[PDB]
Amino acid sequence: STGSATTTPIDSLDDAYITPVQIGTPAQTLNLDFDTGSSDLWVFSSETTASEVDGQTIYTPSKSTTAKLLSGATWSISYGDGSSSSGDVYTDTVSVGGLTVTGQAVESAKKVSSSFTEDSTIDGLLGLAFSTLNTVSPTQQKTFFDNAKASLDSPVFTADLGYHAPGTYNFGFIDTTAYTGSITYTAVSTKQGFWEWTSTGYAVGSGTFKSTSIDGIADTGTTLLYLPATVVSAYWAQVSGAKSSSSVGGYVFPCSATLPSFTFGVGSARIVIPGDYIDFGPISTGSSSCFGGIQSSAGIGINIFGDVALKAAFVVFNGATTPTLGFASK
């Protein structure tokens, strides 16, 4: 089997991407944030505290003939941005882009933090990291991908995120028309439960490539590119007037600037992030200070190849017995 679903930016900045997911019988379609940096499939629901729901579409398990309470199971998750959610668990039928899993754990939110409430476009998350990070207790649950894997033509999914445009998540096949050149594969460590890999270095604009190992995660659920302070300083030093602002919470730059590209290494291959992808616009409406899309990972504890980086590539998440990550230009 295979699946193929279009993923759409939630706003004009590509802050996140939503993908329609069918849950239950008859289908309830919710728009979920596919997150390769976490491993819970959770939804706004008929159980979510009413004051914490503001415009989201909810899953109502009582209206699904295939929903079953997973008795005694609870979940609670905290994300790197400080947001969180928690609740109980149903099993139900879940379909993504024509690919169906029966008995998927669907984590029903009883509580969500303010950032979720305030984002009316995101009806929940669909985690695609390794199932060892799943938060369901006392019986840990598998991700949608893990459950689907045995039925898939090939044990893979691909992320093809757009810049200010829709893109695609495919399951079970590699669309050879969706990228240019060849795919370069690189080793993954699952030791921390993430799609963790080591970039071979970077360049700023037309500058020389610096060969240096940068361990980080491929994380579709993080907007920006978070890298070591040394690397980030070298990038922003090439932008007149750019500076790190503790008041704003990162690097800012004059909105009048033209940003240089940023290149990262994947083995001997190179992925180029155009400068425009690094512009996240005014820090507040009407400001002439703009927020940068490359930020320091210092104090996160991990480097994160978020959407800024991933959307510059066609990315293969290979979930074979020995997992790997592939990157191609597109």
UniProtKB/Swiss-Prot annotation:
Lineage top rank: taxon: Eukaryota
Domain Peptidase A1, first and last residues per copy: 17-328
Keyword line: Aspartyl protease, Disulfide bond, Hydrolase, Protease, Signal, Zymogen
EC number(s) from the headed UniProt entry: 3.4.23.22
Disulfide bond sites: C255-C290
GO molecular function per UniProt: aspartic-type endopeptidase activity
Catalyses which reaction(s): Hydrolysis of proteins with specificity similar to that of pepsin A, prefers hydrophobic residues at P1 and P1', but does not cleave 14-Ala-|-Leu-15 in the B chain of insulin or Z-Glu-Tyr. Clots milk
List of catalytic residues: D35, S199
GO biological process: proteolysis
Similarity comment: Belongs to the peptidase A1 family.
The protein, known as: Endothiapepsin
Native organism: Cryphonectria parasitica (Chestnut blight fungus)
